[PDB]
Amino acid sequence: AKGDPHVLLTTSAGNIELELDKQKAPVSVQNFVDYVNSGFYNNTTFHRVIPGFMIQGGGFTEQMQQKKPNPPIKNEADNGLRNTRGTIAMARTADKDSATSQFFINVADNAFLDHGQRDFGYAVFGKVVKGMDVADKISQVPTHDVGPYQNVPSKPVVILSATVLP
Template identity: 40%
Template structure:
């Protein structure tokens, strides 16, 4: 079904069932490794939150996989579903959302992924910052929009994912469950159960703005222009390319 038609149906459904489809402030990622609650920054990044919730409300993230994990950097998802081994199906993406780089990419935040060289190119892919990535991600490509904050007690789930073996494929270094590094290179075909799966993203609180009392870290670096490869304060170009590689962020249809 055409994305615009689906979006219209979602809007009409939300109008009829406003209490369910309201602009939520707390959502829960139900994953195969455990549940991760996120408080969305409705008041600080309203366009990004609205864009994210459009995908949530239409079920676009149901049974998607975590397709990329870089230890001490990011856990990325929202873009692909399992089909056959590593032949993933891309989640249909809608129009890009305007960049809102108000907050810093510190540990425990969620931000939107986008295409290199285009600050306003975020659509459906997101990533969790599992380290303080502000030195790079707050300034590169117009700054990456942070739109939510993970509940501190749920960070262990993201931390534990880093211990999983990863298979390099056409969408990134993908964390695997009960699938060894040797199997990654031997040609073995993984099944659905071998991927870290986001079963659903559920709305927990849709009636009250709850982000007002959060300790948000502002992006104070956004007005600084990135300099040479070695002056970004934490890894330079090599570090940066972990997120901006075409396999990880280019939208496939």
């Protein structure tokens, strides 16, 4: 939750400020900060949005092109942090340690994503300290509705810049 590093995401729909929990998720925070400082998240979008659930981004450009991320990181979902409204967590595939650059912001309590005995879960590494209204807005933009990409916005919100604050 309330950690130390602060990151500002300036999007085409508004600004979102994050507070990263360096003590509870050291690996996740360092990985995220490295992407931020390298300008990796600049011009990436929230390519997957689900009303009442979450908004996911950090992997595709405005042209819907997948960017080349750095090596995956270990999953820190066992750090006790829960996927409650306002938290930011790492997206990943089947393998628990496959998270790279994609992250999502929970706009509601998504306890089914928390670490459990049957699935390792998704690692929470921070929370939104400002701009939750913006996150909510992003989750409600119109999306496609046919194939496996029906959660992709017609016009994905773009992250114009991401910056670590002083």
